[PDB]
Amino acid sequence: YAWVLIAAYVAVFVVALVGNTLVCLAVWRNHHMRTVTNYFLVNLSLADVLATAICLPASLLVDITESWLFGHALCKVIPYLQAVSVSVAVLTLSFIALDRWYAICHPLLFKSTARRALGSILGIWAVSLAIMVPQAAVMECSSVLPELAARTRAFSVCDERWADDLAPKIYHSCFFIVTYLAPLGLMAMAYFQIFRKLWGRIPGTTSAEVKQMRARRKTAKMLMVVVLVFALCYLPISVLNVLKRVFGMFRQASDREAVYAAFTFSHWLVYANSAANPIIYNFLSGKFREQFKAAFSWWL
Ligand SMILES: CCCCCCCC/C=C\CCCCCCCC(=O)O[C@H](COC(=O)CCCCCCCCCCCCCCC)COP(=O)(O)OC[C@@H](O)CO
Ligand SMILES: Cc1ccc(-n2nccn2)c(C(=O)N2CCN(c3nc4cc(Cl)ccc4o3)CC[C@H]2C)c1
Ligand SMILES: CCCCCCCCS[C@@H]1O[C@H](CO)[C@@H](O)[C@H](O)[C@H]1O
Ligand SMILES: CCCCCCCCS[C@@H]1O[C@H](CO)[C@@H](O)[C@H](O)[C@H]1O
Ligand SMILES: CCCCCCCCS[C@@H]1O[C@H](CO)[C@@H](O)[C@H](O)[C@H]1O
Ligand SMILES: CCCCCCCCS[C@@H]1O[C@H](CO)[C@@H](O)[C@H](O)[C@H]1O
Ligand SMILES: CCCCCCCCS[C@@H]1O[C@H](CO)[C@@H](O)[C@H](O)[C@H]1O
Ligand SMILES: CCCCCCCCS[C@@H]1O[C@H](CO)[C@@H](O)[C@H](O)[C@H]1O
Ligand code: NA
């Protein structure tokens, strides 16, 4: 099982790095690709490259070795960077939904520009880097056998140190609602209103109006799949974290092999999301597909 786990993580690492580099290059090299949505998709690729490059290898060895092998400093930094990546991804997806919902359902309120999208992107990172400092603060690295700590990192564990039973419950309830439930629930409702608008009806609309709607239907369909795939990828880890930290589950030693398997798969699934997003754009965006086809007809 350990080598299938290695092969799964390695496939995702390679596909996510190549795929997300291609997303950044496509938007950067082509003016026709520089849409508000594509600026936010590049930001989602930056969040996903942060998780793929630094957090994915750490999670693979923790899942295999069942120990922390990166020292005390990295015990704070790597969990922090993973929390930052999720906050960036989910706020990026939220801002795309917000942009599309305003552009489509309430067209005359706010202006949707690339410069305003870059302003939002900076704000997303500023917020995410700050709100995830409590995660870095609670991370502690400790040996199960303190006398072996000098000799080896084999019995070293990276985990959250909580001074009371109440604080982890409030924190993990807030983490779930802020980074998963409230933005996805709101995004689901936004896309349902976008769907009703784009796939309904108004006579006497111009050539530029009719063409923009056809283009919008194609993009909205793609974004709905990205949001649904994100909701599915992050659902097992969210459920497991809430069950473990809010409801005090999985503390029995008899269940440890089934618990580790469930968390190992759930951590992998989060990383599979970074590999999924460029694959979704390839199949649901003709603009990205054309770019990827040109990249692979050149590189290979
Ligand atoms: C930290 C997060 C911040 C980032 C979040 C930003 C990202 C979000 C992007 C865009 C937001 C646009 C939201 C658009 C909201 C659309 C809301 C809405 O009206 O949806 C209706 C269904 O919901 C309803 O009945 C209401 C039912 C509510 C469902 C309750 C489940 C909770 C899910 C979680 C909710 C969290 C809310 C937190 C508030 C702060 C169907 O509509 P419809 O046209 O038929 O007419 C309405 C009526 O006449 C029919 O009941
Ligand atoms: C490995 C991994 C992947 C995704 C996760 N996720 N859950 C919700 C959203 N995303 C988590 C997780 O359970 N998180 C996020 C941050 N945390 C974390 N611990 C990490 C350990 C390693 Cl080796 C690498 C990254 C790590 O991120 C601990 C607190 C908790 C909230 C852990
Ligand atoms: C953005 C990152 C900023 C945090 C500072 C990181 C400095 C490297 S620490 C160093 O890294 C190795 C990696 O394998 C471990 O083996 C060592 O034991 C550990 O001491
Ligand atoms: C953008 C604002 C900067 C975010 C900084 C937090 C990132 C985790 S690094 C970690 O921070 C600890 C706080 O718990 C310090 O004790 C250590 O020096 C260091 O290892
Ligand atoms: C921000 C939302 C935080 C709500 C999380 C509360 C955790 C639900 S379990 C609950 O926790 C109580 C407090 O520790 C205990 O008295 C009970 O025995 C136990 O059933
Ligand atoms: C904020 C993140 C935590 C939210 C989790 C929602 C589920 C809690 S309801 C749960 O359901 C049981 C029956 O199944 C009942 O005995 C109790 O009333 C209660 O413990
Ligand atoms: C999305 C994540 C939310 C998952 C739903 C949580 C519902 C679990 S019921 C709740 O949990 C514990 C045992 O399961 C006990 O401590 C409580 O007495 C019981 O009432
Ligand atoms: C490729 C197919 C391999 C899938 C492996 C599935 C293993 C199921 S273990 C089973 O899971 C339940 C979850 O509901 C828990 O209640 C139990 O404690 C636990 O024993
Ligand atoms: Na992601």
From Swiss-Prot:
- Membrane-traversing stretches: 3-23, 39-61, 76-96, 117-138, 170-191, 222-244, 260-283
Give ranges for the Cytoplasmic compartment.
24-38, 97-116
Which subcellular locations apply to this protein?
A: Cell membrane
A GO cellular component term found in this entry reads: plasma membrane
Mode of membrane association: Multi-pass membrane protein
Record bears the keyword Ion transport:
no
Positions glycosylated per UniProt: 150
Q: Which domain of life is it from?
A: Eukaryota
* Extracellular membrane side: 62-75, 139-169, 245-259
Additional notes on this entry: The antagonists suvorexant and SB-674042 bind at the cognate neuropeptide binding site that is situated between the transmembrane helices and accessible from the extracellular side of the membrane.
Task: Return the protein name.
Answer: Orexin/Hypocretin receptor type 1
Q: Which organism is it from?
A: Homo sapiens (Human)
Q: What is the lineage of its organism?
A: Eukaryota, Metazoa, Chordata, Craniata, Vertebrata
User: What's the name of its gene?
Assistant: HCRTR1
